Structure formats: structure tokens, C-alpha cells
Amino acid sequence: TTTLAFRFQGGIIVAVDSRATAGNWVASQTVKRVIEINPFLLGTMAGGAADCQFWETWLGSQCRLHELREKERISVAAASKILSNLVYQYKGAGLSMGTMICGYTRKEGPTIYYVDSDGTRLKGDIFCVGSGQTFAYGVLDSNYKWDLSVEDALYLGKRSILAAAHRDAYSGGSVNLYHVTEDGWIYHGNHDVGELFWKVKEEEGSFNNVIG
Amino acid sequence: TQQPIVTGTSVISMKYDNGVIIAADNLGSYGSLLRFNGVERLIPVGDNTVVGISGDISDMQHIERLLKDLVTENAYDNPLADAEEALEPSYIFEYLATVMYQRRSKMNPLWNAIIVAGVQSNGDQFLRYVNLLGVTYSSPTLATGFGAHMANPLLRKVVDRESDIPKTTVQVAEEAIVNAMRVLYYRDARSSRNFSLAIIDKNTGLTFKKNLQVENMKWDFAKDIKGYGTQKI
């Protein structure tokens, strides 16, 4: 698994792969690793599938409740902390999750918080999590610029996942992209890595050592 | 979190055209010591069910107490206790299967394997297994422990599928059960020669045979076996 989220000029780019494995067995090549908490917040799935899926859907509920009570949109800081604090209550019991809570509010601007089952909650501009994280970071680090256009940013996130899908046995399937703006997130498609690898190779000229 | 102490071996059973038969020897072993020779492991519930139990004997004795209680409690404010609202094999089974699974889920199992054999009020034969883990299954033949390995292959040659049930008579069924019990005395080191057998028929009701003994055994050929390879005398 490889998931990433980065902050830029036009919002947040969230990109993830979609493979699930049990040992050497590829359980699914179509896993949804981005949980749509609500129309404004996104969460990435890494670690335990059930754990992330369950607690992030629940998060989606606690956020709705907050908005009903306070009549104001929940901040990413508070939303993430709801999850983070919960996870800390269960510390030592065995939950497994590495996730990025992404949102873009008026008060905060684009905001990404990495939250894990150990209790860590960190604000940041770029995060990659999963078995393929190291590969995604290489690509991300060398091409990331705060002034990227929404089209180039989406591509970078997409490319970084591709880099991880190629090398990491545990990542692949397809890439799901999302662009997070203040008015909500916009889904930017599902791209089969099989087909995407060949396109990127001819167009970009990369992966030269791979014959095709 | 426990370990069985006094134990009972196989319980075998099979269903035939008008009923079911179930049998189990009368031993209660303490490891390899064949300690108690007068243990009844077949428990009749009313006049239409027999529960055969293998495994830990102190736990079987507990299940016995529970069954007698079910009967007492079902008679309460029940004008039809000896008729329309009497305990059915399916009720006794589901109850036990419930207890077994609850006990395993609390990590304190009743260390047993149980077969509930009986005949429902509308004539249907009932044969179903439940063990220490709450696992349950039904088949034309059912046997626990060792008997699952040696008795089932034999009983299955008689009733291999559902369609074979209506073609099998009590005479045939009882013969097969009795032979399986002999094979088990031959090859199971924890068996006893003394056993009990029960037949639950939709017409003749419950016939419970106590103090049966495996007879017609073949041991004569042993006279001609000497050494373990080359010894001639």
C-alpha cells in the first residue's frame, strides 16, 4: 500500500493505490483506500483495513454531530484530534492504522494531519504512508513545489504512486486521485496501473530498463 | 481454560428409514488407565431423544443435570408437557449447541463432543453433532473422536447419501452399528468391550439396550504370527 497527501497552492492532493495482500496472495486490486468522511474531509487507509474504515466512518459521524451542535463546519485540527484521541484510548490493544486526515477550511487553509494507532498526530505538508512510502517520497520530494498547478499536482501524486506501484510488491492495482479545495473535494479518477505504466513510459521516457 | 481428566471415547450413530440408532461404550478413562467400567454415556431425554456424549466425564455429568432440569422446567405451567409441548430433539439440541458455544466464547469450554439423536413429532429423524467449540453438523451418520475415523467409513457403506436412508432397516442399521463397535474395540486403545445402544423409532419409540458386549471376534489367526520378520518359531 502507498498513500500520499500533500499541501499546495490550489488545495490538497490525495493519491493512493488500491492493492490488498494477505501474505503473497493479492486479495484485491480494487480496494478503496480513501475514506470519504464527508464532502469536505478525506482520510487515507493504511494499516488495518477495518480499523481505518470503521473509525474514519465513525469520525464522519462525530463531525456531523459537531456541525449540528455548533452550526459551524468542523476544523481539520478538531476532526483529526477526535480520531487521534480515540485511537489513544485503545492504545496497546492492537489497532493498526496510519492515516492522513485532509481538509481545507476557511480558518485553517489546506490542512493535513497524519494520525496513527500509536497516538501520533502531526500537522504537515507532505506525508506518504504504506509499504510503498519510500518510493513515493523520492518522486514527491524532488518535484514538489508550492506553486504547482492543480493539473501538475494531480500528476505528481499520480506519478509518485506509480513509482511505488512498480517497485513495491505490495502496491499496485490502480491509483485513485482526489483534489481537496475549500468548497469540498473533487475526485479525479481511477487509473489502472497496468495501463498507466505503459502510457507514462512512452510519454515521459522513464522506466527505460523496462522493455515494452 | 481447562484439560479433560476422566474421559469417554466414541459415540456413533446413523439414521435409518424410521429412526436413528446411537451407541457408546461404557468406559471412563483416566489417561491410559481404563478406570471406570460402568459409565453410561447415552442420555435419554423423555421418550424421543438420546444424547450421546464423549469427552470429559465431569462435564458430561453437568450436561446430564442440565437436561434433567430442562425437563422439570418444561413441565412447569405446561398442561401439555407429556404431549404437544414436550421436548423435541431439535429443542434439546439447539439448547446444548447454545451452551457449548457460549462456554467456548468465555474460554471455559465443556470439553465434550455430543450427538443428539432423536425423532421429531412429525416423524422426521434428527441427528446432529455439537462439540466443545460450538461447531455443529448433520449427516446420515455421525461419530465422534476415534469413531469418526473408523466407524463413519463403515456406516457410510450402508448409508452413503440421503436417498439411502429410506432403503435401510433397523435390522441392517443395528448390525452395522454393532460391527463398528467391534472394530473400535479392536483398534481404539481407549475402548471398552461393554456398550450401550439406543434406537429411537417413529413407531416402536425408544428402545434402550444396556449391557451389550462385543461378540463374534476374530483372534484365532494370532496363533500363526511369530516374531516381527524373520523369527520362525
Partner: protein, 204 residues
């Protein structure tokens, strides 16, 4: 810790109408890290093909050992080793290391030059022979290949059709195995000619 799961890879061989086929993937990895996409697992000594899956250092060592042994054989016997014979040589070579085995899964495919009968065989790591008339599978996606082969296979296919069959058995089996893929190669073997085709497949 499981030497048969460190590097990844699969091989499958099938028999047809006056032909055999043996195919393999091209991945070499180190646990999750893909390392090479050019690691062929099928080797041939004359007209006998041997595919080997398993721990890569042993795969390489065994190819070298069989080349050595088949070279000497050819010199002493003055003729190239046959599939039936080589099969026995592989088996005896593997069992020689019964208590410190090579972690591999060899597969032999070939056609006897005298009788023309197609031949394939598989072995476990200590030499047990499986001489099937249909197909042999080996590797980290052996269950998958068994599934594919049991459904896709039908007897007496022509070279042109066996190709499609073995290719699909291989391709789809690999796509459900994390440690296999990154390319594939299929050999269609006939009495007179042997054709080698590289397949286009996902690279994740």
C-alpha cells in the same frame, strides 16, 4: 525465513499435440522490493528445458550444475541427454542433498528425439517426481496456476493454441501473486523448432 518465498516467481509447463510449452515470469525481488525484471527461470541443455522457481541463488547454482553434468554426459555418451533421462538426473541430484536441500521447484519440458513423445515433469525440493500428462506448476503462485490450468487446459492443443493457453494460465496466475510478474516468457517447443515469446503484462 521461508527460502521459497524470498525471491518470487513461477513456471508452468504444458503438453500439446506433438509439442510442449514451458513459461515463466521474469521477476526477482527481495521480499517486497522488485530487483530485476529480467530474471529468466527457464534454461535448456540441448533440447531439454528446465525451469526452476525458488531461492534465486539455488536456481542459478542448479542451472550451472546441470550444464556441467549435461556437458559431461554429452562427451561420454556422445549424444544429447533426453527428457526422461534428465528428469532422473535432476531427481537424484536433488535427493543427494536430502537433509540440506536446494529450495527450488524444478520443471522439465521437452520432446524425446527418438520417439517424439512430448514430456514434462515437476519435482519437490528433495527430488520427488511428478510425471503428468497434462501440466506442471511451480512457484509462489502455484495454487493460482493450478486453478488456471485445471480450468483452461484441454488435451492435444496445437502449438498455436497451447501458446494462448499457457500464456493465460501464467499471466492471470501471476497477477494474483505479489511476488510474481514483472514480465513473462513462453517457449513453444516442437520436434524441430522452439519459439520463445515475451508477453506484455502489468508491471506492478
Amino acid at each position: 525465513s521461508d527460502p521459497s518465498s524470498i525471491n518470487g516467481g513461477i513456471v508452468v509447463a504444458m503438453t500439446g499435440k506433438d509439442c510442449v510449452a514451458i513459461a515463466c515470469d521474469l521477476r526477482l525481488g527481495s521480499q517486497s522490493l522488485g530487483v530485476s525484471n529480467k530474471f529468466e527461470k527457464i534454461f535448456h541443455y540441448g533440447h531439454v528445458f528446465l525451469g526452476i522457481t525458488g531461492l534465486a541463488t539455488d536456481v542459478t547454482t542448479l542451472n550451472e550444475m546441470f550444464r556441467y553434468k549435461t556437458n559431461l554426459y554429452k562427451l561420454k555418451e556422445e549424444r544429447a541427454i533426453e527428457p526422461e533421462t534428465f528428469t532422473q538426473l535432476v531427481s537424484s541430484s536433488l535427493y543427494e542433498r536430502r537433509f540440506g536441500p536446494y529450495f527450488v521447484g524444478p520443471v522439465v519440458a521437452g520432446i524425446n528425439s527418438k520417439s517424439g513423445k512430448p514430456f514434462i515433469a515437476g519435482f519437490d525440493l528433495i527430488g520427488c517426481i511428478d510425471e503428468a500428462k497434462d501440466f506442471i506448476v511451480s512457484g509462489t503462485a502455484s495454487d493460482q496456476l493450478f486453478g488456471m490450468c485445471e480450468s483452461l487446459y484441454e488435451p492435444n492443443l496445437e502449438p498455436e493454441d497451447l501458446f494462448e493457453t499457457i500464456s493465460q494460465a501464467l499471466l492471470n496466475a501471476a497477477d494474483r501473486d505479489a511476488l510474481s510478474g514483472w514480465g513473462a516468457v513462453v517457449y513453444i517447443i516442437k520436434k524441430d523448432e522452439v519459439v520463445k515469446r515475451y508477453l506484455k503484462m502489468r508491471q506492478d
